[PDB]
C-alpha cells in the first residue's frame, strides 16, 4: 500500500504564511523523490515543487520560487511545503506526489489538502428544510431537500438521516454569491415513508464546528 496523506491546508488571509505537510508510508522514502502539485478552481493541475531524494537539489516554477520552500524530513518520513506571501492564486488543493525511480514523472498522489487564501470571514451555514409543496400529486415517490445557504469557507458535509439514507441523494456543487457559498441536496424517499417515517439533513460545517440537523416536516 503506498499512502501519501497530506495535512495543513486551512483558510489564510492574503499575505499569510502556512506550512503544509505530507507523511508517507509503504515505500522506501529516501529511494524516492517527491513533489507538491496543486489543482486549482477550473481543475488545471500546476506542479509546484520537486525535491531530490537526498534533499540536495530542489526545484521550483517561477510562480512560487522564493516564496515556497519544500523540505523532506526523511528521518521521520515527513515531506513539507513551507509557503509565504500567499496571494489568492494559491487557492487550490495540494497533492503530495512521489516520482518514480526515473525522477521526471509522478506515479502516486496523496489525498490532497485544500488551501483557501482570502480576506473573507468564515461564516457558519443556515440550513433550510425543503419540504414538498409543488404542483402534481403523490404516488410511488417523494423528494425532499435541504438548502444550506450562506457559508464560508468550503467544505460542508451533507448526509441524510445520519448515513442510513443513501438511495436517491444528489448534493449539488456549491455556487458562490457575495463572498458566501450556497448548496443543496435533494433526496428520494418512497411515498409511504416521509410522512410517517422521518427524513433529516445533518449539515456539518467543519470550519466553525457548526453541526445542524434539520428534520423535514410538512
Amino acid at each position: 500500500e503506498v499512502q501519501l496523506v497530506e495535512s495543513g491546508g486551512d483558510l489564510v488571509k492574503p499575505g499569510g504564511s502556512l506550512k503544509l505537510s505530507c507523511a508517507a508510508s509503504g515505500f522506501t522514502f529516501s529511494r524516492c523523490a517527491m513533489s507538491w502539485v496543486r489543482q486549482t478552481p477550473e481543475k488545471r493541475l500546476e506542479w509546484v515543487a520537486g525535491i531530490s531524494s537526498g534533499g540536495s537539489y530542489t526545484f521550483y516554477p517561477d510562480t512560487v520560487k522564493g516564496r515556497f520552500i519544500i523540505s523532506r524530513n526523511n528521518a521521520r518520513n515527513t515531506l513539507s511545503l513551507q509557503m509565504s506571501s500567499l496571494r489568492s492564486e494559491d487557492t487550490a488543493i495540494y497533492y503530495c506526489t512521489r516520482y518514480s525511480s526515473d525522477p521526471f514523472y509522478f506515479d502516486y498522489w496523496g489525498q490532497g489538502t485544500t488551501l483557501t487564501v482570502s480576506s473573507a470571514k468564515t461564516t457558519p451555514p443556515s440550513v433550510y428544510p425543503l419540504a414538498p409543496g409543488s404542483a402534481a400529486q403523490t404516488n410511488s415517490m417523494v423528494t425532499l431537500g435541504c438548502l444550506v445557504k450562506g457559508y464560508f469557507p468550503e467544505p460542508v458535509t451533507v448526509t441524510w438521516n445520519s448515513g442510513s439514507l443513501s438511495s436517491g441523494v444528489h448534493t449539488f456543487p456549491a455556487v458562490l454569491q457575495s463572498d458566501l457559498y450556497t448548496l443543496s441536496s435533494s433526496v428520494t424517499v418512497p411515498s409511504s415513508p416521509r410522512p410517517s417515517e422521518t427524513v433529516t439533513c445533518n449539515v456539518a460545517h467543519p470550519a466553525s464546528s457548526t453541526k445542524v440537523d434539520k428534520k423535514i416536516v410538512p
Binding site: 488545471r44 514523472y105 506515479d107 433550510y128 414538498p132 409543496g133 438548502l147 449539488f172 456543487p173 443543496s184
Partner: protein
C-alpha cells in the same frame, strides 16, 4: 514552459466504442537522452489522479490493455479501445522531459447513455427562511441525459425572472445522468407580492416544456 494543448474538451463515447484523446506539445517532448516522458493520468471523479501510461507506450501496473498511448516528439494520442462504464473521468497528458513539467488542460470522457428526461420537483421557501426575510424557491431537475437543459423561472407567469443560481453535478458514476438545481432568490416582500411561481424545463427528451408550479397561498 511547454504549452500542451489537449483536445477534445469532452469526448462523448458510448460503452463499447473506442475513444481517442489527443495532446500536443508546442515544443518537443523527445529528449535526446534516449526518449520522451509523456504521460497520461486519469482522474475518476472525487479521487486523486492515477498514472495510466508513462513514456508514452507503457501502462503502469494495474492499467489494462485497452488503454494504449502513442505518438513521439510532438503529437501524442491515447486510445481507450472499448469503453467500460467505469472509465469516466478527466484525462490529463503530462510531460516530464522539460523543466518545469507541465500538464494538459484535460479531456472529460462522457459515457453516452440513452436519453433520459428530468424528473422535476419545486419547493416553496421554508417559513424559517421566510421569517428571517428571504425567500429561495428551489427547483430540482433530476436524473437526465443529455446534460443540456434550459430552465426559466416564471413569477405570475409574466415574470420570467432573473436573480437565480444553477448547479449541475458531474455525470453520475452509477448511471451516466446529471442533475441540476436552480434556486430563485427573492426577498420576503417581493415574494409575497406575487401568487404563482414556476419552474419551466426545456430539454431534448420532450418536445413540450416540462412545467412545475405552486400557487403561494392555495388552500
Amino acid at each position: 514552459d511547454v504549452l500542451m494543448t489537449q483536445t477534445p474538451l469532452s469526448l462523448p463515447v458510448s460503452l463499447g466504442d473506442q475513444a481517442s484523446i489527443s495532446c500536443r506539445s508546442n515544443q518537443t517532448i523527445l529528449l535526446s537522452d534516449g526518449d520522451t516522458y509523456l504521460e497520461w493520468y486519469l482522474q475518476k471523479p472525487g479521487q486523486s489522479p492515477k498514472l495510466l501510461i508513462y513514456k508514452v507506450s507503457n501502462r503502469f501496473s494495474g492499467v489494462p490493455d485497452r488503454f494504449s498511448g502513442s505518438g513521439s516528439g510532438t503529437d501524442f494520442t491515447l486510445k481507450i479501445s472499448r469503453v467500460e462504464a467505469e472509465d469516466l473521468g478527466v484525462y490529463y497528458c503530462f510531460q516530464g522531459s522539460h523543466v518545469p513539467p507541465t500538464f494538459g488542460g484535460g479531456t472529460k470522457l462522457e459515457i453516452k447513455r440513452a436519453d433520459a428526461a428530468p424528473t422535476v420537483s419545486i419547493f416553496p421557501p421554508s417559513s424559517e427562511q421566510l421569517t428571517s426575510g428571504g425567500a429561495s424557491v428551489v427547483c430540482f431537475l433530476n436524473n437526465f441525459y443529455p446534460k443540456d437543459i434550459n430552465v426559466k423561472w416564471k413569477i405570475d407567469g409574466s415574470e420570467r425572472q432573473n436573480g437565480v443560481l444553477n448547479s449541475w453535478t458531474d455525470q453520475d458514476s452509477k448511471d451516466s445522468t446529471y442533475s441540476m438545481s436552480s434556486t430563485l432568490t427573492l426577498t420576503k416582500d417581493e415574494y409575497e407580492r406575487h401568487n404563482s411561481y414556476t419552474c419551466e424545463a426545456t430539454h431534448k427528451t420532450s418536445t413540450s416544456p416540462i412545467v412545475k408550479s405552486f400557487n403561494r397561498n392555495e388552500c
